[PDB]
Amino acid sequence: TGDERFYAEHLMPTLQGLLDPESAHRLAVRFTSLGLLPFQDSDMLEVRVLGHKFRNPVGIAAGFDKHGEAVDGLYKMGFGFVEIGSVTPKPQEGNPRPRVFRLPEDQAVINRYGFNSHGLSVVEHRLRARQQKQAKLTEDGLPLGVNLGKNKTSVDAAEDYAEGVRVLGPLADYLVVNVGKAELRRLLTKVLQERDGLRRVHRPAVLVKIAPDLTSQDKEDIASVVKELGIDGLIVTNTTVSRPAGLQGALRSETGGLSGKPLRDLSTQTIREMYALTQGRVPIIGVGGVSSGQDALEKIRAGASLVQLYTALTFWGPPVVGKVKRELEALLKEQGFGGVTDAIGADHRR
Numbered sequence: 566t567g568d569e570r571f572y573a574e575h576l577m578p579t580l581q582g583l584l585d586p587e588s589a590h591r592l593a594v595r596f597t598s599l600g601l602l603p604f605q606d607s608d609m610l611e612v613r614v615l616g617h618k619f620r621n622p623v624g625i626a627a628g629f630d631k632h633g634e635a636v637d638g639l640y641k642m643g644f645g646f647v648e649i650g651s652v653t654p655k656p657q658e659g660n661p662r663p664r665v666f667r668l669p670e671d672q673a674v675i676n677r678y679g680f681n682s683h684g685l686s687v688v689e690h691r692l693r694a695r696q697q698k699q700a701k702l703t704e705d706g707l708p709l710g711v712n713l714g715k716n717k718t719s720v721d722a723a724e725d726y727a728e729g730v731r732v733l734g735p736l737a738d739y740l741v742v743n744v745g746k747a748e749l750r751r752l753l754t755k756v757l758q759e760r761d762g763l764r765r766v767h768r769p770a771v772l773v774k775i776a777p778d779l780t781s782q783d784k785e786d787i788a789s790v791v792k793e794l795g796i797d798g799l800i801v802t803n804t805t806v807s808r809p810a811g812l813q814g815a816l817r818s819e820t821g822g823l824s825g826k827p828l829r830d831l832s833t834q835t836i837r838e839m840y841a842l843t844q845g846r847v848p849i850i851g852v853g854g855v856s857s858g859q860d861a862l863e864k865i866r867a868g869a870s871l872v873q874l875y876t877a878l879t880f881w882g883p884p885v886v887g888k889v890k891r892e893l894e895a896l897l898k899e900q901g902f903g904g905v906t907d908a909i910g911a912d913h914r915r
């Protein structure tokens with residue numbers, strides 16, 4: 566479309582030339598929350614997973630709406646599901662600024678926000694203000710996830726996550742915990758017990774979100790514990806602390822997590838491995854460097870039932886959401902799939 570080209574070639578490069586990345590993100594949150602925003606979802610794109618219907622498989626990844634300020638605007642942008650957070654138990658400021666950096670030559674970002682969070686109570690009251698509106702959205706195929714963090718100074722990480730389950734679990738369709746083997750088992754056992762203690766109408770799925778930076782041994786151990794405990798899904802992946810050869814941006818050596826195109830295929834290969842190690846029985850939300858329908862379908866074919874993006878929104882703006890969905894629909898037809906569902910995991914059946 567013309568909007569896609571105008572955002573990508575003119576408006577976004579101009580905003581990014583005028584505004585540092587944190588200011589630009591804050592402006593994005595404000596515009597989105599007001600619905601100040603520039604594709605028809607077809608039956609082909611619907612996915613049923615995690616106990617819910619998803620009208621389309623393209624979600625906004627954690628971190629864009631850390632405090633739950635823009636959920637309704639994010640649905641208006643075209644996302645099939647929204648994940649807010651990470652939310653920590655107590656409010657905390659996060660790292661000193663600047664704490665996020667653009668790598669324009671790489672179509673990448675590095676960030677070290679450090680879990681800046683309004684905290685559980687503020688977010689709880691924010692979501693309560695729209696709780697029934699969300700119930701209707703979810704029923705109509707637009708679910709809500711809540712990503713749970715821990716405070717920097719916490720001495721008992723499992724208890725921080727347990728608090729998040731109790732406070733925000735009743736308002737979410739799924740919860741996310743970001744992640745020796747016995748220590749992971751202890752943590753997830755406690756999270757699942759707290760989840761099971763909520764009333765059935767307020768009882769969310771629980772997913773584990775992993776980094777792309779894990780050893781083979783770590784991945785094997787996670788797959789084992791996830792299957793043993795009955796964890797509902799995996800989110801694959803967070804940003805990378807690696808720095809692939811070939812980054813050109815002047816800021817490539819800043820501390821933090823790298824996202825965007827240089828992360829893309831590390832993430833896809835991590836999806837592929839986790840799908841295999843769980844025998845395709847554990848739903849995966851695939852995330853990392855998704856900017857096109859091809860990127861989305863590669864992750865779906867590798868094992869993802871849903872995908873998310875963030876960094877592509879920061880470079881290309883709101884039209885990228887409809888772009889990904891249109892390209893994904895077109896590729897699915899070209900490859901002979903009846904819908905997203907038939908493509909999930911398809912590379913493993915070659």
Ligand SMILES: Cc1cc2nc3c(=O)[nH]c(=O)nc-3n(C[C@H](O)[C@H](O)[C@H](O)COP(=O)(O)O)c2cc1C
Nearest residue numbers: 626627628650651802803824825853854874875876
């Ligand atoms: C500025 C920024 C902040 C983020 N904060 C969070 C967060 O609070 N919790 C989380 O699980 N992931 C966070 N992420 C990771 C994203 O959810 C996602 O896993 C990662 O960026 C890869 O997707 P992308 O390449 O499409 O950006 C953040 C990413 C960015 C760029």
Ligand SMILES: Cn1nc(O)c(C(=O)Nc2c(F)c(F)c(-c3ccccc3)c(F)c2F)n1
Nearest residue numbers: 580586589590593596597601878879882883
């Ligand atoms: C690291 N980093 N760098 C950036 O420029 C951003 C960001 O969020 N940009 C950003 C922006 F500046 C916008 F104006 C919209 C935006 C939002 C609503 C309507 C129009 C434009 C946006 F989606 C964005 F992602 N993050």
Ligand SMILES: O=C(O)c1cc(=O)[nH]c(=O)[nH]1
Nearest residue numbers: 677678679680681804822
């Ligand atoms: O807040 C952050 O720094 C943050 C959290 C997270 O989970 N991933 C990321 O890239 N940054």
Ligand SMILES: [Cl-]
Nearest residue numbers: 586665666667
């Ligand atoms: Cl920058």
Ligand SMILES: [Cl-]
Nearest residue numbers: 815816817818
């Ligand atoms: Cl360097």
Ligand SMILES: [Cl-]
Nearest residue numbers: 806819820821
């Ligand atoms: Cl680092």
